Write a protein that binds this ligand. Structure first.
Ligand SMILES: [Cl-]
Ligand SMILES: [Cl-]
Ligand SMILES: [Cl-]
Ligand SMILES: [Cl-]
Ligand SMILES: [Cl-]
Ligand SMILES: [Cl-]
Ligand SMILES: [Cl-]
Lengths: 42, 85
């Protein structure tokens, strides 16, 4: 992977979980299950 | 149908409304956070959450209904933006 891990860590640390980070293909159903997961978290 | 409510705290519902707001509008700048329109957004979120809370039959279905709503709102935002390109 090409994003330096320190930058990756900086971005991920500072991004709300509910915000999308990119638009990689995945079915509607998989995204909804992911969203269910994001809501369940503490 | 409504027994699961006993386990759901107001503290939980509040965290969920918060996640619902972030899902609609992830990282507002200070000006946006201060805008009256941000209140409109928050009220809409609380409205959706309350709707799902009062129509789900289990905690699992409650999360699922919220997720479906989020999917649908985000899809609406993405489409509107693409339509202007
Ligand atoms: Cl978060
Ligand atoms: Cl769809
Ligand atoms: Cl995965
Ligand atoms: Cl019951
Ligand atoms: Cl105004
Ligand atoms: Cl209430
Ligand atoms: Cl328009």
């Amino acid at each position: 992977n090409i994003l330096p891990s320190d930058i990756m860590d900086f971005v991920l640390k500072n991004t709300p979980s509910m915000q999308a980070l990119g638009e990689s293909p995945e079915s509607k159903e998989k995204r909804i299950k992911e969203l269910e997961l994001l809501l369940m978290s503490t | 149908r409504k027994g699961w409510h006993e386990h759901v705290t107001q503290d939980l519902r509040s965290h969920l409304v918060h996640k619902l707001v972030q899902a609609i509008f992830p990282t507002p700048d200070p000006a946006a956070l201060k805008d009256r329109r941000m209140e409109n957004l928050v009220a809409y979120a609380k409205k959706v959450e309350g709707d799902m809370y009062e129509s789900a039959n289990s905690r699992d279905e409650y999360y699922h209904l919220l997720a479906e709503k989020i999917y649908k709102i985000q899809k609406e935002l993405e489409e509107k933006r693409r339509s202007r390109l």
